[PDB]
Amino acid sequence: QSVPLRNYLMTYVMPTLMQGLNECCKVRPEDPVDFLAEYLFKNNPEMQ
Amino acid sequence: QSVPLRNYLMTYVMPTLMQGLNECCKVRPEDPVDFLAEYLFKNNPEMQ
Amino acid sequence: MSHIQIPPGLTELLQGYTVEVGQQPPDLVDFAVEYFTRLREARRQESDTFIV
Amino acid sequence: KNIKWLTHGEFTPEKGRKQIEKFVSTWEFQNRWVYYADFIEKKDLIHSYHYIYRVRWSAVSANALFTIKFNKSKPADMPVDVSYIFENSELLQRPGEIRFREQWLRDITETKHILLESIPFKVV
Amino acid sequence: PAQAVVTLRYGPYSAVGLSVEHRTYRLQGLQAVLAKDGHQIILEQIEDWNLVELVVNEETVFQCDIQELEFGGDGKLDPLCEEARIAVLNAF
Amino acid sequence: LQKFMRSPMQYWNQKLPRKLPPLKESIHLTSLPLPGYLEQGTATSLIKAMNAAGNLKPKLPFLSVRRSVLLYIAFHLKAFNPKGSEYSRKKYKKKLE
Amino acid sequence: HQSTVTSYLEDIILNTEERTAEEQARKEIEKIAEEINNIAYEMENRRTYLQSEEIVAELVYSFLIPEVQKDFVKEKVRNAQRKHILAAHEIIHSNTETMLEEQVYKELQSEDFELEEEAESLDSEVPTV
Amino acid sequence: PTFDKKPLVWGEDLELYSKFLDRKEQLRLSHASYLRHHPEAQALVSDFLLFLLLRRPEDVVTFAAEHFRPFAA
Numbered sequence: 001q002s003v004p005l006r007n008y009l010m011t012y013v014m015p016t017l018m019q020g021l022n023e024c025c026k027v028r029p030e031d032p033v034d035f036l037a038e039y040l041f042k043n044n045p046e047m048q
Numbered sequence: 049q050s051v052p053l054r055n056y057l058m059t060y061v062m063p064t065l066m067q068g069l070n071e072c073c074k075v076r077p078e079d080p081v082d083f084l085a086e087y088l089f090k091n092n093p094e095m096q
Numbered sequence: 097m098s099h100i101q102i103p104p105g106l107t108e109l110l111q112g113y114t115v116e117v118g119q120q121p122p123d124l125v126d127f128a129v130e131y132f133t134r135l136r137e138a139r140r141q142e143s144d145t146f147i148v
Numbered sequence: 149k150n151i152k153w154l155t156h157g158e159f160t161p162e163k164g165r166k167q168i169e170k171f172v173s174t175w176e177f178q179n180r181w182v183y184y185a186d187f188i189e190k191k192d193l194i195h196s197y198h199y200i201y202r203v204r205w206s207a208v209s210a211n212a213l214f215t216i217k218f219n220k221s222k223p224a225d226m227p228v229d230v231s232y233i234f235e236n237s238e239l240l241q242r243p244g245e246i247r248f249r250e251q252w253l254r255d256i257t258e259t260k261h262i263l264l265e266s267i268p269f270k271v272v
Numbered sequence: 273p274a275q276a277v278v279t280l281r282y283g284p285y286s287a288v289g290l291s292v293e294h295r296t297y298r299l300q301g302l303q304a305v306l307a308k309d310g311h312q313i314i315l316e317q318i319e320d321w322n323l324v325e326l327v328v329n330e331e332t333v334f335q336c337d338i339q340e341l342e343f344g345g346d347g348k349l350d351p352l353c354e355e356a357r358i359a360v361l362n363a364f
Numbered sequence: 365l366q367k368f369m370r371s372p373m374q375y376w377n378q379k380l381p382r383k384l385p386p387l388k389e390s391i392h393l394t395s396l397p398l399p400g401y402l403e404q405g406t407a408t409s410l411i412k413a414m415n416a417a418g419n420l421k422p423k424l425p426f427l428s429v430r431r432s433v434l435l436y437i438a439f440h441l442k443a444f445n446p447k448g449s450e451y452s453r454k455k456y457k458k459k460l461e
Numbered sequence: 462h463q464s465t466v467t468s469y470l471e472d473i474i475l476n477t478e479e480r481t482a483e484e485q486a487r488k489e490i491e492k493i494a495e496e497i498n499n500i501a502y503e504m505e506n507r508r509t510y511l512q513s514e515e516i517v518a519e520l521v522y523s524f525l526i527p528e529v530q531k532d533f534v535k536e537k538v539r540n541a542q543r544k545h546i547l548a549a550h551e552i553i554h555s556n557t558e559t560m561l562e563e564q565v566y567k568e569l570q571s572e573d574f575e576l577e578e579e580a581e582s583l584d585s586e587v588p589t590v
Numbered sequence: 591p592t593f594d595k596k597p598l599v600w601g602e603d604l605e606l607y608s609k610f611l612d613r614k615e616q617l618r619l620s621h622a623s624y625l626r627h628h629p630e631a632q633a634l635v636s637d638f639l640l641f642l643l644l645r646r647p648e649d650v651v652t653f654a655a656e657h658f659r660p661f662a663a
């Protein structure tokens with residue numbers, strides 16, 4: 001039963017999570033708020 | 049002796065009893081009574 | 097896009113509304129206006145103190 | 149005030165327009181802002197229709213939307229079911245309610261101006 | 273009309289001693305009644321508990337708590353099922 | 365059959381009603397669903413637990429109350445098991461004594 | 462603006478009504494429990510063996526079936542939790558880069574739930590962080 | 591020898607705490623469904639909140655009361 005929900009997790013992660021992870025790896029800031037603002041700034045163009 | 053019977057049973061026995069019952073049901077044994085009695089003999093030596 | 101930020105205060109007003117909604121009022125439109133009238137004294141003061 | 153409404157078959161779309169316009173004419177207090185109404189599509193529903201009109205004002209502009217239901221499965225003599233919306237508002241107001249505030253028209257147009265001041269010029 | 277096309281909406285409920293879930297059996301009686309009257313009915317699992325609603329034209333008028341109904345059979349002796357039949361007839 | 369042969373006129377003509385046809389299917393705990401076999405086993409189990417705890421209000425030295433009571437109850441369950449191997453049941457009974 | 466407000470308002474409503482129901486239930490149950498304790502103490506004087514036998518037989522019998530149903534429900538609740546735990550595990554792979562990891566984990570906890578709910582949830586991260 | 595009628599918190603009795611949780615969820619979903627029948631309750635608040643955040647007056651209570659009192663019968 002974990003396998004179906006694993007597949008669901010993957011099916012979200014591919015369109016969704018992986019972009020957020022890729023940006024999080026891009027920014028690598030020393031200040032978390034920098035990552036908050038970067039995340040928002042990338043997210044909105046993607047959600048658009 | 050302080051504890052009236054309902055509460056005495058509830059607190060002391062029932063959680064452990066409920067858990068063992070759940071596991072016996074997951075067994076679906078030929079005899080619940082034998083399995084549960086043995087299960088308790090094994091657990092309670094550790095389980096308080 | 098012009099973004100937004102979350103101050104407090106509004107949250108407490110919504111909380112009061114939901115709590116009186118917890119009564120499950122009928123009469124909703126006026127019941128809500130009356131609820132804000134009740135706020136006008138009582139819940140506004142309470143909220144002002146509640147924040148800490 | 150409000151006007152009073154035809155029946156499902158006594159209604160015609162043009163009668164609907166006239167009735168809605170007259171309802172808006174019963175609005176009064178800021179009615180130095182004058183209304184005119186626009187015609188909007190029929191929506192076709194399994195045993196029902198909706199049919200639609202917009203209203204617009206000029207004196208920035210105010211606007212209103214009116215909704216009318218039609219009963220494919222119940223008598224032509226069924227009184228029409230009518231509801232109306234302001235472009236800002238979620239509120240499915242109904243003609244029998246306590247009347248709107250024209251003040252909301254002032255409020256809406258002011259808010260439009262305020263967003264005009266707000267504009268993020270992310271302009272093409 | 274006769275042989276209406278219909279949807280039924282049904283809310284999850286706790287049987288005696290038992291979890292709150294979507295369940296059908298009294299509803300299966302209602303379904304049988306409606307089908308025998310002639311109709312096509314589709315079933316919808318509403319989140320709101322225990323509740324029964326009846327829909328045509330998208331228009332909806334019914335309310336019941338599933339446990340109020342008779343269980344299984346043609347339900348002929350259950351007054352509420354006849355009330356549903358009446359309401360359906362009136363919907364026409 | 366002997367009585368029938370002796371006096372068949374008493375019996376041979378019949379019009380039974382439709383009722384009580386039911387042929388038995390012997391139901392099994394494995395065959396049952398979870399609440400049914402649970403109910404069957406638990407009814408005896410709880411009867412035994414109820415008597416054992418309520419009457420004794422048990423404790424044994426050095427043990428926790430919980431330990432004493434649970435262990436005693438499990439033994440009591442074994443000792444009264446409707447189908448426990450009976451010499452073993454009496455062995456547990458002796459331990460319980 | 463409307464979409465943002467809707468999300469904010471609905472969420473806050475859900476949370477507050479949840480708390481309100483919780484408090485109402487807490488009050489009611491606490492009362493009922495006090496009544497139960499009173500009855501129990503009185504009957505500890507009053508009781509006769511036959512009475513106790515019936516009373517607790519009722520209690521155990523009526524409880525155990527709900528206990529089984531509640532357990533199986535929590536089995537499926539735990540299955541949902543395991544979904545969230547594996548979502549955390551998936552992000553934990555990306556966490557192995559480790560650089561933001563410490564503060565990120567807090568947001569991740571919410572993100573597991575919100576991604577499990579819907580594909581649009583990432584908007585919800587922006588305010589929730 | 592010492593004697594007490596120990597007061598029990600519901601958390602102490604699994605049966606009571608379960609009943610509490612079940613009742614809690616039942617109420618929670620009841621209230622949700624009640625608002626779901628009366629979306630207008632949410633809709634009014636939502637509209638007020640929207641125009642408030644458009645304007646962002648710091649006295650939320652003034653602006654909302656200014657919307658509500660015109661509704662007042």
